[PDB]
Amino acid sequence: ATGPTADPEKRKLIQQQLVLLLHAHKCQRREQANGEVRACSLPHCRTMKNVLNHMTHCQAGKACQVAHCASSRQIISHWKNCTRHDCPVCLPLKNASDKR
Amino acid sequence: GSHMVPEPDLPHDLRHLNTEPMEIFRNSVKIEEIMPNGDPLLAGQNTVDEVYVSRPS
Ligand SMILES: [Zn+2]
Ligand SMILES: [Zn+2]
Ligand SMILES: [Zn+2]
């Protein structure tokens, strides 16, 4: 419950980047629909938009110089396929998207 | 379980991600309020696409 097999601190860090990319993917579409409007407020919306626009053309993948690019490419692929109702990382997202 | 539930088994495919860059996000997100409250399984296409990640094959 505290070792590298579960790590509460690390578990929150991958969740936080994963969700920030999910926000920024559609927020980039929202922003471009009005050129460059400053209507948002997420602390890293701009950070993710820069990484996402880069990822959309980057071909270095596993050997890229952008620390967030290869990480983000792998992080998205987890949530794209996981369905386990007690997954430590997906649980807050599986709850964020529940009918309750 | 004596006061709070234990931390579940972190997915091994995400353990491989270096989390040092992510430390900037440690107190800057709302995991539960970002989501459009639609469905979890809907993530297959709502999240991103093959052109968005430069799919090699
Ligand atoms: Zn935004
Ligand atoms: Zn890259
Ligand atoms: Zn999962």
Cα distance between residue A29 and residue B12, in whole Å:
32
User: For residue A8, what is the domain's CATH number?
Assistant: 1.20.1020.10
Which one-letter DSSP state was computed for residue B10? -
Range of the domain at A53: 1-100
Number of Cβ within a 10 Å radius of residue B33:
10
Of B56, B23, B36, the closest CA to residue A47 belongs to B23
Q: Which residue of A has its CA nearest to B23?
A: A13
Q: Which of A12, A73, A96 sits opposite B35 (nearest CB)?
A: A96
Q: Which residues of A touch B35 (CB under 8 A)?
A: 19, 22, 93, 96-97
Experimentally, the structure was elucidated by: NMR
> Please, are residues A45 and A24 in contact by the beta-carbon 8 Å criterion?
yes
Cα distance between residue A69 and residue A5, in whole Å:
24
Amino acid at B18: N
Question: How far does the CA of residue B30 sit from the closest CA of chain A (Å)?
Answer: 8
List C-alpha distances in Å: A23 to A62, B16, B20: 24, 23, 21
Q: Which residue of B has its CA nearest to A19?
A: B31
Question: How far does the CA of residue A75 sit from the closest CA of chain B (Å)?
Answer: 7
Q: Which residue of B has its CA nearest to A85?
A: B40
- Which residues have CB under 8 Å from A8's CB, separation 6+? A1, A2, B7
